[PDB]
Nucleic acid binder design. Structure first.
Lengths: 60, 185, 84, 99, 141
RNA sequence: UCCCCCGUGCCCAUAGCGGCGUGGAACCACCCGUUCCCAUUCCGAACACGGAAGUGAAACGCGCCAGCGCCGAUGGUACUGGGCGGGCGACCGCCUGGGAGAGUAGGUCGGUGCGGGGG
RNA sequence: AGAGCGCAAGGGUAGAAGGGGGCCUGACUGCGAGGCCUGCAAGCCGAGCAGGGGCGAAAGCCGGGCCUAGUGAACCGGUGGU
RNA sequence: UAGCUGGUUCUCCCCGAAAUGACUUUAGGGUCAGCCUCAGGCGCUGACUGGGGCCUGUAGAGCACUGAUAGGGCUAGGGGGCCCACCAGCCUACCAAACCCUGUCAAACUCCGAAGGGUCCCAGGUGGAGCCUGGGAGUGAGGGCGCGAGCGAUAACGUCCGCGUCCGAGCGCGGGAACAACCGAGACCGCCAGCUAAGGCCCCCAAGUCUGGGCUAAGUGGUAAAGGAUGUGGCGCCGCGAAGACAGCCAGGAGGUUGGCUUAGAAGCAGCCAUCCUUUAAAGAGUGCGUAAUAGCUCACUGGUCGAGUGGCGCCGCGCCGAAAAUGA
């Protein structure tokens, strides 16, 4: 089960509630953030959620 | 008659169309996969036969599998072809429409009143060995306010019927002269 | 501006709409007395250890789990599994 | 057509399904849960007397004892078109308090 | 000129119009057919004017079938009377027309005849149109 | 443990409808009687009760057929989470994941669980 | 199941609520868990337990009405009564 | 007295509201509930999401009920009659109960009915999350933007709700020339340090007069339509041609006939119906023009010359016309 790390790309500032709450779920507080977080389809769901405001990678 | 054929797969619908080839499907009692072919030549062939006559599609699998069409589902908006269904033929009982040929100009006609037909194709069950190209039926002397239906039509022996047949095949009705402006009063 | 006639009305009225529907869905625990369905008709006929009253209401009769049910030629049903 | 779920009006808990023919009684004890039945007796299908009534009495009575003989207190009474004439077994003897 | 005959509610809501047309996109009837391209209403006034327009062009014609039916109220209020107060009045009866919808068919004429008939008539219609023959759609109840 | 009938339960019409054939040696049904219990808003039709030489007509039980009625893939369009556009506007297109309705082929005259009376 | 289901509408309804007769008066009293609903105050749901009853051989239901309108805090005072 | 107006003084450090829900002699006002706050109590529970299970009746779509509906059939029958009664019988380009076929309409119609959404358990989740008592609040004129329905006229910077977001309190920053809410973007201070967002890279102005292919000729670009056109350039189809087409250029361009009727006269030729056949390479019962009808011009059509491409039907990319207003463009 390889780890998943994301980079925050596009500002949270101006997006629906679920989006914001998701970011605030990911230990993600401001722009340009390498967030190294182990795989778990809950987290993944929360990725495909935030998928655009961010950038992804399954770093091992 | 002959058209090409192409075995379809798991490729997205939209693309196949906005590349060059309309997509399709075939099924017969058990045989069901996905298929497709060219547009322009397909449209040419169709415009002749379609669900009137028989199609023969020689397919890039080695054979020359002949079908009939069946159903022409379109996009409706700016209506035009977009995925049909094909029927893999055999020799078993099958219902289908036969384009009819109203031949001869009657008495209700020429008196003024013109045929307002009901059908230009009748549902009939046949063995695929009989090919009723088109029942070139009468309509010798239909009168104005006169009708014809049932088994009135000649049926090529074997090619049975498949309605009531009290299904009224056609009839002649009045014109629409400028005296229908007097109606406006 | 000419304010002459103007066709009035006699329509605008509704209802202090009470909130009606499946109050307790399945997988839910009840202590008996908890109503699971507030309905107008009998869209949900009584289930096992579920009761009904004057206003067509499926409520609890024990301490267990709401279980949903359908019976085409008998209607739809809502029950409560024991949990002993 | 005495369906009416006279069943339901007795589907409180634990049935006892009985019915008659031209000449033979069919007294049976059915338990639900899964559908499992239980206890039998028949006026002219237990190889018994040929007088509908009294046989039935005794037959129910036979079954009656059978009930307590295998651990039975009180149950229901599944009867369609009765006109309630007791069938003076009525399983009233019938342990159960039929009547 | 068509409408129902007093039925259910009088006033109803105009609403926005998408474009699935729900159905009605081939000939089956006549022989030549006028079908539309702009999502709008067909006006009973227009409706009659176009039907005429055809009839008018070809004296002693055939049979002109009308598929669509104008059965929707024009909620219209009076003039210079200030807002609020009541809905309007049912007025001008029309219909929903979503493009790719058959509206009228000509049968038993010249090619030229139905050409110019559908041409002029639809030319009088609240929008613009396409005029089609009768083929590629066959097989549809 | 099995082939048949019956008292009765489960799925919810692929069980229902309809033409054909059907079985009673037990079961089942008509049927024998209306005097004893009982009752018809009138008839013993219905429930009720005492009972034969017949019957298997109906009721019913079982088989065949799809003719009505029932279910119905596959594909692809609709519509749309959520993401970007384009047009004053009425409205339109690309992305992803979801994914009908109607129809097309085909399929359907049931499935099963119990307890007794028969061989 | 498209009729009746008191009276508007909607849901619901014969595996009855409808329709017939017999009997009766639970259109009970003392309560009431746990709920619906919810700014408050109101309104709405009900087993159960005791009494003492009505129906049915029973099993059983009965604390009005197929369901949602038919209504009015408090202060004032009349009322029979402890 | 004034539920109104007006004014209300020092500094930094932290969070940070609402313009709603009901209620009133209330609507520009107060209680309350939601939202801010600080102390003490609570401890993975909360926002969010993965899994399972459930409720739902919209977007579509369907016509099986509710009604609306267009066209034909079939017919109960209604105008009817032919024409006998204890009563019958056969009968229409009239209209019409129902049924059937042929399409279809719907917020208050529904056999079907999704994407969603709500919600109950398994688990991740450490966040100025969430929970519990408690004191002080301020709020209760909102506005904008997006899809979603109403109102309006599918008008209003109009209005009234729904989810959402910003302005409000972010008139702090970059774009958009300028520009509360459109794009980018959450501003402790300092830095003559680099990357990048939107948006740009001739210049005002900072950076490519970067590379390659395809378009347009009007200031289009630098703001409108239906509707009209031998504008331009690629795509697709459909007959014609070296046995000689396309255009022009020579010539033929006929007869019953003055077609039957209308019609004052209608002779291809103002209209009605027409729907010949015959001599012929070819001349139609006619393409427009011409007449008082006639005459006549011409065409259509085949061969003479000529000698290579032609006539047209749709689609698509950009324009052209359509297109007039008030101080200086």
């Amino acid at each position: 089960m390889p780890r998943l790390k994301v980079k925050l790309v596009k500002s949270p500032i101006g997006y629906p509630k679920d989006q914001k709450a998701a970011l605030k779920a990911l230990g993600l507080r401001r722009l340009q953030q390498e967030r190294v977080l182990e795989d778990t389809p809950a987290i993944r769901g929360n990725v495909e959620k935030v998928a655009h405001l961010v950038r992804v990678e399954v770093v091992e | 008659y002959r058209l090409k054929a192409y075995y379809r797969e798991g490729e997205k619908p939209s693309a196949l169309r906005r590349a060059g080839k309309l997509p399709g499907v075939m099924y017969n009692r058990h045989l069901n996969r996905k298929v497709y072919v060219d547009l322009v030549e397909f449209d040419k062939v169709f415009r002749q036969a379609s669900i009137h006559h028989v199609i023969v599609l020689e397919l890039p699998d080695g054979q020359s599998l002949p079908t009939l069409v069946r159903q022409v589902n379109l996009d409706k908006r700016r209506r035009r072809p977009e995925h049909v269904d094909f029927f893999v033929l055999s020799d078993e009982p099958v219902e289908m429409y036969v384009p009819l040929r109203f031949v001869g100009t009657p008495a209700g006609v020429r008196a003024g009143g013109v045929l307002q037909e009901i059908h230009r194709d009748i549902l009939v069950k046949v063995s695929p060995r009989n090919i009723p190209e088109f029942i070139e039926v009468d309509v010798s002397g239909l009168e104005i306010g006169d009708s014809l239906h049932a088994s009135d039509l000649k049926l090529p022996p074997g090619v049975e019927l498949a309605v009531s047949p009290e299904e009224t095949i056609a009839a002649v009705v009045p014109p629409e002269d400028v005296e229908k402006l007097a109606e406006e009063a | 501006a000419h304010k002459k006639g103007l066709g009035s009305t006699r329509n605008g009225r509704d209802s202090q709409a009470k909130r009606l529907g499946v109050k307790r869905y399945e997988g839910q625990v009840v202590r008996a007395g908890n109503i699971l369905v507030r309905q107008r008709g009998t869209r949900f006929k009584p289930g096992k250890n579920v009761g009904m009253g004057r206003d067509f209401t499926l409520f609890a009769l024990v301490d267990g789990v709401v279980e949903f049910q359908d019976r085409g030629r008998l209607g739809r049903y809502v029950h409560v599994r024991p949990l002993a | 057509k005495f369906r009416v779920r006279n069943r339901i009006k007795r589907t409180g808990r634990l049935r006892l399904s009985v019915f008659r023919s031209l000449k033979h009684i069919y007294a049976q004890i059915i338990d639900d849960e899964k559908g499992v039945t239980l206890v039998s007796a028949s006026s002219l299908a237990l190889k018994l007397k040929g007088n509908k009534t009294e046989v039935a009495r005794q037959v129910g009575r036979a079954l009656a004892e059978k009930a307590l003989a295998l651990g039975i207190k009180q149950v229901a009474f599944d009867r369609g078109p009765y006109k309630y004439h007791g069938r003076v077994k009525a399983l009233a003897e019938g342990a159960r308090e039929g009547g | 000129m068509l409408m129902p005959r007093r039925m259910k509610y009088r006033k109803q809501q105009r609403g926005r119009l998408k474009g699935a047309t729900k159905g009605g996109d081939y000939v089956a009837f006549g022989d030549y057919g006028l079908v539309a391209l702009e999502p709008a209403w067909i006006t009973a006034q227009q409706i009659e004017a176009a039907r005429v327009a055809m009839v008018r062009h070809f004296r002693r014609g055939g049979k002109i079938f009308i598929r669509i039916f104008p059965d929707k109220p024009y909620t219209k209020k009076p003039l210079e009377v200030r807002m609020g107060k009541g809905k309007g009045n049912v007025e001008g009866y029309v219909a929903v027309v979503k493009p790719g919808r058959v509206m009228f068919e000509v049968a038993g004429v010249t090619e030229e005849q139905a050409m110019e008939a559908l041409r002029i008539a639809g030319h009088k219609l609240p929008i613009k149109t396409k005029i089609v023959r009768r083929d590629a759609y066959d097989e549809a109840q």
